[PDB]
Design a binder for these strands. Structure first.
Ligand SMILES: [Mg+2]
Ligand SMILES: [Mg+2]
Ligand SMILES: [Mg+2]
Ligand SMILES: [Zn+2]
Ligand SMILES: [Zn+2]
Lengths: 106, 63, 908, 114
RNA sequence: CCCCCACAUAGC
RNA sequence: GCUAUGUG
């Protein structure tokens, strides 16, 4: 029951594609997608960021990288129904935790 | 190279089916669509793109 | 311009010469010929007719033609004498008789005929070849079934890819029905005029008019007899391909009128069938029994069933199925089936019915539980929009939504395989066979493939000859009813079907009933009709395709009696070696070489040809399944009477042909086709395979020019073949042996269930004297409603390489011992995928994997002889893995390869 | 014997399956028949109370059963319940064209005879 | 929970 | 007698 996950992660490490290890080590930090990742251009993607260092790595200005692909940030929910802009959050005012971002395929 | 992609997609869908995702029909339908078009695929590119889709489906819930 | 001024006459039609003027045009049309010289249904050149097309006022071309045939003076005076006795019929084309000085020569001018006759459409649909459809395309365009840009889509002809082509042919259907009505009126005029003759298809316009009166003989008026056997018999597939009687569903048989509101309680329709027969087939000489319980022998059951197939397309689909009746047990009202209404066999009433019985013992409550009457009466009404098939009831408030689990992965064998250098990029061997997982709608999407089964008539004279030739392929066996103690059942721990799978397996029903109870149940089925319910199970296999596989597990009350009815003949077929049907023959110990040398017997110019059936389980017509069951029941002249044999046929046709199939907790009706869980499905499939091959040879021999045949024995065989089909109604029991010897000499076959390989004569097929792939394609187009793709079916020219594909095995010639031995080897991807993917995770235990891998290595031994090196290393990898596993936990011991080469040496 | 056990099981399932029938519209069409027998395919069509429609998509829903009433088999049916493929209860207001990709197709509606 | 028929093969 | 695998 439990060994099938370990065998899957063993052959996932044996695969060593950049998108796969990128997604699993973002999941190691707490960055979790809430829907199925789409491959069609201009389709919606939900993803969560749990802390600010994960925002430092994963979020990149106005277009953030995920699964070795860039995604245009549109709208952010801080799980309190407060619509967060891109100019609002900085490291000066990091207490606001995890915040849900929508995106589109470049 | 591409054979290990198919051999890990079958065990990924096995882990998903063991995590009781087949109770949800709307998720299991696109899981088996991704898995069947992985096994029918002949290239490494589309196989790895559908592989990151299926792995993102797994990493959606905690497991 | 004087001859063109003469041909118009008083009709006042603007005419232009279609061919060169004042001389005859040469066309290439299909004819139906029977002389002492040449006989058959083939294409000829017609060189005695000069044709003129009629123009409108806006000068676009019109379908009306003026076919002028100038002949001898004798036929001129004869046709004038006969046409004066036929000009008052409405269905006779206008003939203008005149003479002209081209040197006078007599001229017969016919008015407003069509470019194509009925025989052109019949030959174009019955001899169909892609890329040679110009006659069919012209007929489909000039009658607005579709415009000319419809054919730019390819796979337009295919019934499986493009099911709108049935909607295309349904616009030809009403013109065909009007031609049938005009044929009946012409036969009435011939009988009332005292004229005896034969009606051939090429003498009938596509408007329905009749125009060739040369061969007709006068008699006294009122005593004329017309001959319409070849006409209706050749026309019969077109009536259900184009759906000709679809206008009979309307209120006064007019298409611009609504449907008939038939009563829901009506089930008889016998007067309706007789009225339809006297409307459309009035001068058909044989008697028609609407209910086939009044049929003399099985060659009358085939006849009346072939008429009931056409006539049951008019009646509503609620009237068919079982006929239930209220029956009291201790004054408690039940609802049980005391009959059945068949689309093919008419109305059948049970004989032994007990309206009041105080007690219910085990046999009758088994019959009452297997009945769909109680389940479909108690359940809820169902309207399933996922399926085109007619849905009757839902047994639960829920809906079953079963899925197919993906296959478990054997990581250890994959690590061993990549340790041995397999699955490098660019090698010929890779993984292509996997367990394909399916979603919840898989069972109902697989059940919806029964929409390919269409109601299909057959050429009944041709089918009645072909059944006699197919019965010759089953002569060396013996059969008959065995007793309940003489039955042999392989696995008792199998499921007993619905609803019996709740209480136990088939072991419980074979241990609970004594032999007297089973014999009483068989005697009940010989006098009554028991309908049953077959559950659709999802097969769990490994394949290269994405499709799901569904088996139809038939209940115990059908298979228990079908075993006693068929077991002796099926065991006799499986025990006999050297015959055409090769069920029961090993491929081991030189059995593959023995089978291949049995096929390669004495054929003079041998090629090898093999074909496949597209959707054989689904698109099988009901006439051919009935014919297969009749051929298999022809071994019963001693132990069963005619009524017992008809009731066994009706039981089997009600249990495995038009059954009430339960796909996921809700009952549907099955439109037809074979069932995979039948007690006799492989052998009925073999009868159907031999039937299609024999009728492809008949269509090959009849559709060639008999003048162009060099041999005279073959030409006399063709002239006798047309006569034995369409002239005599008796079975010519010594020409059947001659045709069977001809097919054994020039068209030798190997037949397993639907897979087949033949060893045919090259110079005979290239001359068009036996069947090729083109004749198979035409036969499967008009008798099977499928398109056999030519890209799948193969032809092999060299003999020393064997057949390309038989039982999914490739063959190679190898030197084993000292003589050259044919060996079967599989695709290495199939063996590798069976090795690395298992169906259940408990099968990855070592005590089961040693057995699984030694069986896989026994199947994979003849790859070592293959010239490709990685193919040869497949068996070495399997053997090294068995060595690894056996060393973890002597030729009769299984870790050394002479054990695996002993399985293919002919001495055992 | 176990044949007595399985015959008791089949006896009880026959007894339950006859109580499931209510004999009003069954007796009407059976006793209105001329030979005493009717086709089985019209027994639930004219006798059953519940109707279950399985609808695969949204364009099939607007043609067969849209609203709270619909006419099938020459009768009026009142929609009691709509349940999707995950056996969850679905309201009638959820079924709309903008909400249709969010729904777990097929829908299994349940109707009663008026 | 469901898992057909037939034939071949292997180990006890 | 059980199990497994191939073939349709
Ligand atoms: Mg002619
Ligand atoms: Mg086939
Ligand atoms: Mg085959
Ligand atoms: Zn008859
Ligand atoms: Zn018999």
């Amino acid at each position: 029951t439990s060994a099938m996950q370990t065998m899957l992660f063993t052959m996932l490490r044996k695969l060593d594609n950049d998108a796969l290890n990128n997604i699993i080590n973002n999941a190691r930090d707490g960055c979790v997608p809430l829907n199925i990742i789409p491959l069609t251009t201009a389709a919606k993607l939900m993803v969560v960021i749990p802390d600010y260092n994960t925002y430092k790595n994963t979020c990149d200005g106005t277009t953030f990288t995920y699964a070795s692909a860039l995604w245009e940030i549109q709208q952010v929910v801080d799980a309190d129904s407060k619509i967060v802009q891109l100019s609002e959050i900085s490291m000066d005012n990091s207490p606001n935790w995890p915040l849900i971002v929508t995106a589109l395929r470049a | 190279k591409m054979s290990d992609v198919k051999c890990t997609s079958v065990v990924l869908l096995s882990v998903l089916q063991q995590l009781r995702v087949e109770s949800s029909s709307k998720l299991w339908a696109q899981c088996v669509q991704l898995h069947n078009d992985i096994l029918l695929a002949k290239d490494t590119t589309e196989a790895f793109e559908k592989m990151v889709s299926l792995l993102s489906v797994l990493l959606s819930m905690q497991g | 311009q004087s001859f063109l001024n003469r041909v118009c006459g008083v009709s006042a039609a603007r005419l232009t010469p279609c061919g060169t003027g004042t001389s005859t045009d040469v066309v290439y049309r299909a004819f139906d010929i029977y002389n002492d010289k040449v006989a058959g249904f083939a294409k000829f050149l017609k060189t005695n007719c000069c044709r003129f097309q009629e123009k409108d006022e806006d000068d676009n071309l019109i379908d009306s033609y003026f076919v002028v045939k100038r002949h001898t003076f004798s036929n001129y005076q004869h046709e004038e004498t006969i046409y004066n006795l036929l000009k008052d019929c409405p269905a006779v084309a206008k003939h203008d008789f005149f003479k002209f000085r081209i040197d006078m020569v007599p001229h017969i001018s016919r008015q407003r005929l069509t470019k194509y006759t009925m025989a052109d459409l019949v030959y174009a649909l019955r001899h169909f070849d892609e890329g040679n459809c110009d006659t069919l395309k012209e007929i489909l365009v000039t009658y607005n079934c579709c415009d000319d840009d419809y054919f730019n889509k390819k796979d337009w002809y295919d019934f499986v890819e493009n099911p709108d082509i049935l909607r295309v042919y349904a616009n030809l259907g009403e013109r065909v029905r009007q031609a049938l009505l005009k044929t009946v009126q012409f036969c009435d005029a011939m009988r009332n005029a005292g004229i005896v003759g034969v009606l051939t298809l090429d003498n009938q316009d596509l408007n329905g008019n009749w125009y060739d009166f040369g061969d007709f003989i006068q008699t006294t008026p009122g005593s004329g007899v017309p001959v319409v056997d070849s006409y209706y018999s050749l026309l019969m597939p077109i009536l259900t391909l184009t759906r000709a009687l679809t206008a009979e569903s309307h209120v006064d048989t007019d298409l611009t009128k609504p449907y008939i509101k038939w009563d829901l309680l009506k089930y008889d329709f016998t007067e309706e069938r007789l009225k339809l027969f006297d409307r459309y087939f009035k001068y058909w000489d044989q008697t028609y029994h609407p209910n086939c319980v009044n049929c003399l022998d099985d060659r009358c059951i085939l006849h009346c069933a072939n008429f009931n197939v056409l006539f049951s397309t008019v009646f509503p689909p609620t009237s068919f199925g079982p006929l239930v009746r209220k029956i009291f047990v201790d004054g408690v009202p039940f609802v049980v089936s005391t009959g059945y209404h068949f689309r093919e066999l008419g109305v059948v009433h049970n004989q032994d019915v007990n309206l009041h019985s105080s007690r219910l013992s085990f046999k009758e409550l088994l019959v009452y539980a297997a009945d769909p009457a109680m389940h479909a009466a108690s359940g809820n009404l169902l309207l399933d929009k996922r399926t085109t098939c007619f849905s009757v009831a839902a047994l639960t408030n829920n809906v079953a939504f079963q899925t197919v689990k993906p296959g478990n992965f054997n990581k250890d064998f994959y690590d061993f395989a990549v340790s041995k250098g397999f699955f490098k990029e660019g090698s010929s061997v890779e993984l292509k066979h996997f367990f394909f997982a399916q979603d919840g709608n898989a069972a109902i999407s697989d059940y919806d493939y029964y929409r390919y089964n269409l109601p299909t008539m057959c050429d009944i004279r041709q089918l009645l000859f072909v059944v006699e030739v197919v019965d010759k392929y089953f002569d060396c066996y013996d059969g008959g009813c065995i007793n309940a103690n003489q039955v042999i059942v392989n696995n008792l721990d199998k499921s007993a079907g619905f609803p019996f799978n709740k209480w136990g397996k088939a072991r419980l029903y074979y241990d609970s009933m004594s032999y007297e109870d089973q014999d009483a149940l068989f005697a009940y089925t010989k006098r009554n009709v028991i309908p049953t319910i077959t559950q659709m199970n999802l097969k769990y296999a490994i394949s290269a395709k994405n499709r799901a596989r569904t088996v139809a597990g038939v209940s115990i009350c059908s298979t228990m009696t079908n075993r006693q009815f068929h077991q002796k003949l099926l065991k006799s077929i499986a025990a006999t070696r050297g015959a055409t049907v090769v069920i029961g023959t090993s491929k081991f110990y030189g059995g593959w070489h023995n089978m291949l040398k049995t096929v390669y017997s004495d054929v003079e110019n041998p090629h090898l040809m093999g074909w496949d059936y597209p959707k054989c389980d689904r698109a099988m017509p009901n006439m051919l399944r009935i014919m297969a069951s009749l051929v298999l029941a022809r071994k019963h002249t001693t132990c069963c009477s005619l009524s017992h044999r008809f009731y066994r046929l009706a039981n089997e046709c009600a249990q495995v042909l038009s059954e009430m199939v339960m796909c996921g907790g809700s009952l549907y009706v099955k439109p037809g086709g074979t069932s995979s869980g039948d007690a006799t499905t492989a052998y009925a499939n073999s009868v159907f395979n031999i039937c299609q091959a024999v009728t492809a040879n008949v269509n090959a021999l009849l559709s060639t020019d008999g003048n162009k045949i060099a041999d005279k024995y073959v030409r006399n065989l063709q002239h006798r073949l047309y006569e034995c089909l369409y002239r005599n109604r008796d079975v010519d029991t010594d020409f059947v042996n001659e045709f069977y010897a001809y097919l054994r000499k020039h068209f030798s076959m190997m037949i397993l269930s639907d897979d087949a390989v033949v060893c045919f004569n090259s110079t005979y097929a290239s001359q068009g004297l036996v069947a090729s792939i083109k004749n198979f394609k035409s036969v499967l187009y008009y008798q099977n409603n499928v398109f056999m793709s030519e890209a799948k079916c193969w032809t092999e020219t060299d003999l020393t390489k064997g057949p390309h594909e038989f039982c999914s095995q490739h063959t190679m010639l190898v030197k084993q011992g000292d003589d050259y031995v044919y060996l079967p080897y599989p695709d290495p991807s199939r063996i590798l995928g069976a090795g690395c993917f298992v169906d259940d995770i408990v099968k990855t235990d070592g005590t089961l994997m040693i057995e699984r891998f030694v069986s896989l290595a026994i199947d994979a031994y003849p790859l070592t002889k293959h010239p490709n090196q990685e193919y040869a290393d497949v068996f070495h990898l399997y053997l090294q893995y068995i060595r690894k596993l056996h060393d973890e936990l002597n030729t009769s011991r299984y870790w050394e390869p002479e054990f695996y080469e002993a399985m293919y040496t002919p001495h055992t």
